[PDB]
Design a protein around this motif. Structure first.
Motif, PDB file in Angstrom:
ATOM      1  N   UNK A 109       2.677  -3.331 -10.336  1.00  9.25           N
ATOM      2  CA  UNK A 109       2.151  -2.012 -10.003  1.00  9.25           C
ATOM      3  C   UNK A 109       1.724  -1.950  -8.539  1.00  9.25           C
ATOM      4  N   UNK A 110       1.101  -3.023  -8.065  1.00  2.86           N
ATOM      5  CA  UNK A 110       0.641  -3.091  -6.682  1.00  2.86           C
ATOM      6  C   UNK A 110       1.778  -2.782  -5.714  1.00  2.86           C
ATOM      7  N   UNK A 111       2.900  -3.472  -5.887  1.00  8.73           N
ATOM      8  CA  UNK A 111       4.062  -3.268  -5.031  1.00  8.73           C
ATOM      9  C   UNK A 111       4.536  -1.819  -5.083  1.00  8.73           C
ATOM     10  N   UNK A 112       4.656  -1.285  -6.294  1.00  9.98           N
ATOM     11  CA  UNK A 112       5.102   0.090  -6.482  1.00  9.98           C
ATOM     12  C   UNK A 112       4.273   1.051  -5.634  1.00  9.98           C
ATOM     13  N   UNK A 113       2.954   0.900  -5.699  1.00  9.52           N
ATOM     14  CA  UNK A 113       2.050   1.754  -4.937  1.00  9.52           C
ATOM     15  C   UNK A 113       2.217   1.523  -3.438  1.00  9.52           C
ATOM     16  N   UNK A 114       2.226   0.255  -3.039  1.00 12.54           N
ATOM     17  CA  UNK A 114       2.377  -0.102  -1.633  1.00 12.54           C
ATOM     18  C   UNK A 114       3.583   0.601  -1.019  1.00 12.54           C
ATOM     19  N   UNK A 115       4.717   0.532  -1.710  1.00  6.48           N
ATOM     20  CA  UNK A 115       5.941   1.164  -1.233  1.00  6.48           C
ATOM     21  C   UNK A 115       5.692   2.622  -0.861  1.00  6.48           C
ATOM     22  N   UNK A 116       4.769   3.259  -1.572  1.00  5.91           N
ATOM     23  CA  UNK A 116       4.435   4.655  -1.318  1.00  5.91           C
ATOM     24  C   UNK A 116       3.864   4.831   0.086  1.00  5.91           C
ATOM     25  N   UNK A 117       3.026   3.887   0.501  1.00  4.13           N
ATOM     26  CA  UNK A 117       2.413   3.935   1.823  1.00  4.13           C
ATOM     27  C   UNK A 117       3.420   3.557   2.904  1.00  4.13           C
ATOM     28  N   UNK A 118       4.114   2.444   2.696  1.00  7.26           N
ATOM     29  CA  UNK A 118       5.106   1.971   3.654  1.00  7.26           C
ATOM     30  C   UNK A 118       6.130   3.061   3.960  1.00  7.26           C
ATOM     31  N   UNK A 119       6.556   3.770   2.921  1.00  4.06           N
ATOM     32  CA  UNK A 119       7.533   4.843   3.075  1.00  4.06           C
ATOM     33  C   UNK A 119       7.120   5.796   4.192  1.00  4.06           C
ATOM     34  N   UNK A 120       5.874   6.255   4.142  1.00  2.00           N
ATOM     35  CA  UNK A 120       5.355   7.171   5.151  1.00  2.00           C
ATOM     36  C   UNK A 120       5.237   6.480   6.505  1.00  2.00           C
ATOM     37  N   UNK A 121       4.723   5.253   6.495  1.00  2.00           N
ATOM     38  CA  UNK A 121       4.561   4.484   7.724  1.00  2.00           C
ATOM     39  C   UNK A 121       5.880   4.384   8.482  1.00  2.00           C
ATOM     40  N   UNK A 122       6.920   3.924   7.794  1.00  2.57           N
ATOM     41  CA  UNK A 122       8.238   3.781   8.402  1.00  2.57           C
ATOM     42  C   UNK A 122       8.927   5.135   8.530  1.00  2.57           C
ATOM     43  N   UNK A 123       9.424   5.430   9.727  1.00  8.24           N
ATOM     44  CA  UNK A 123      10.107   6.693   9.980  1.00  8.24           C
ATOM     45  C   UNK A 123      11.475   6.716   9.304  1.00  8.24           C
TER      46      UNK A 123
END
Length: 83
Positions: free
Chosen positions: A64-78
């Motif tokens: 679950x942690x990874x799944x959520x993290x990906x949500x943040x990274x997505x925005x971070x990375x253009x």
């Protein structure tokens, strides 16, 4: 008013203390992959930031942690539409 022998009787009883240490992940800070192996940055309770440690995905007992993290990274990375 004279003090001969003051007898005081009281009972509180407070025995609630124990020294123990456990390892509990906080959250996924970063993620890296090497030699076809995925790894994540784990942080055990108590370990400071500089005391960060890396571990293999297979060991990461928290999908679950990874799944959520990906949500943040997505925005971070253009890159939303264009791959």
């Amino acid at each position: 008013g004279s003090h001969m022998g003051k007898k005081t009787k009281r009972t509180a009883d407070s025995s609630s203390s124990e020294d123990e240490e456990e390892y509990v992940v906080e959250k996924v800070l970063d993620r890296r992959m090497v030699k076809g192996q995925v790894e994540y940055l784990l942080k055990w309770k108590g370990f400071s930031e500089e005391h960060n440690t890396w571990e293999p995905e297979k060991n990461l007992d928290c999908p679950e942690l990874i799944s959520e993290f990906m949500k943040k990274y997505k925005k971070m990375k253009e890159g939303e539409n264009n791959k």
